[PDB]
Amino acid sequence: SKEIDISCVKIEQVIGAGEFGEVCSGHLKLPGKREIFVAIKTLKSGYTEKQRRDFLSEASIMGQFDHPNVIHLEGVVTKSTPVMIITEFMENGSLDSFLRQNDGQFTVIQLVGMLRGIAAGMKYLADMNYVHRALAARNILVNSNLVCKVSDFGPIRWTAPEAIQYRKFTSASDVWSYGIVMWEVMSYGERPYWDMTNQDVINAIEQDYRLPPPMDCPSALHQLMLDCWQKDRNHRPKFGQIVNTLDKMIRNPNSLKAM
Numbered sequence: 001s002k003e004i005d006i007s008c009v010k011i012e013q014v015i016g017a018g019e020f021g022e023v024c025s026g027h028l029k030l031p032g033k034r035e036i037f038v039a040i041k042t043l044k045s046g047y048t049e050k051q052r053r054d055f056l057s058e059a060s061i062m063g064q065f066d067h068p069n070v071i072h073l074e075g076v077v078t079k080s081t082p083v084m085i086i087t088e089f090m091e092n093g094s095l096d097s098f099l100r101q102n103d104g105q106f107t108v109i110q111l112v113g114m115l116r117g118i119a120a121g122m123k124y125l126a127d128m129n130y131v132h133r134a135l136a137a138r139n140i141l142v143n144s145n146l147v148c149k150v151s152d153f154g155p156i157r158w159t160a161p162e163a164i165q166y167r168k169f170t171s172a173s174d175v176w177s178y179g180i181v182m183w184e185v186m187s188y189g190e191r192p193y194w195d196m197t198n199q200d201v202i203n204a205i206e207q208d209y210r211l212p213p214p215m216d217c218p219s220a221l222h223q224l225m226l227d228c229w230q231k232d233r234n235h236r237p238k239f240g241q242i243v244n245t246l247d248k249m250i251r252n253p254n255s256l257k258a259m
């Protein structure tokens with residue numbers, strides 16, 4: 001969205017590597033507004049016109065959104081070099097790697113909290129008529145308070161049967177993906193279907209196989225997963241319902257006691 005003048009940006013250091021260039025952290029001080037810490041995606045020089053457009057497309061997409069569970073876009077730098085995409089800063093980075101570094105360090109209530117935010121963000125996106133198509137733990141960022149937000153607006157084992165076979169992507173297929181994500185979270189970053197091959201995964205799902213309950217996962221959360229993994233997309237829950245279901249679990253914590 002908004003075009004930012006390089007004079008307002010002061011890069012601090014490298015915090016990650018994107019496919020289009022380095023990812024940094026830094027300060028943003030717009031005229032009048034108060035300085036803030038941000039994340040800065042840069043484009044490697046010598047880029048092709050296609051690379052430039054694809055890179056900036058990500059900003060155009062997320063720029064059209066605005067929700068606490070969707071990565072906030074501060075703006076972009078295109079008039080001068082390097083080209084940049086400034087966004088919200090998420091100290092804990094990617095959710096999957098984040099969970100791997102904290103194996104079994106959270107309560108069911110915390111995990112459910114993370115899943116609720118992701119659900120709220122997807123509910124928002126669905127209402128805005130946006131189909132992510134690539135929902136997965138690696139595409140969700142987490143901050144200090146553990147708030148998870150959907151990212152990557154620029155994967156067999158994560159995709160619904162129909163989407164894989166007929167390339168039919170809908171919010172419904174995102175619900176299936178959300179199911180896999182729920183598994184990833186309760187598994188603390190474990191890879192879905194483990195070392196199974198992508199083809200094995202396809203044949204397994206065909207044979208009505210479904211990922212088992214992750215360790216210490218309440219039977220109520222695994223059932224919600226199954227619902228998300230229903231062969232018939234029309235039967236899968238809506239993100240709105242997924243949210244309410246999660247909310248009900250928060251009301252009466254004893255509903256998560258049945259292991």
Ligand SMILES: Nc1ncnc2c1ncn2[C@@H]1O[C@H](COP(=O)(O)OP(=O)(O)O)[C@@H](O)[C@H]1O
Pocket residue numbers: 015016017018019020023039087088089090091093094141151152154
């Ligand atoms: N807003 C952000 N705050 C903190 N770290 C970030 C942020 N965006 C990206 N990163 C870090 O940079 C890495 C690469 O960025 P990512 O957006 O996942 O790449 P791409 O979407 O280009 O494939 C992430 O795995 C994460 O650790």
Ligand SMILES: [Mg+2]
Pocket residue numbers: 138139152
């Ligand atoms: Mg990524």
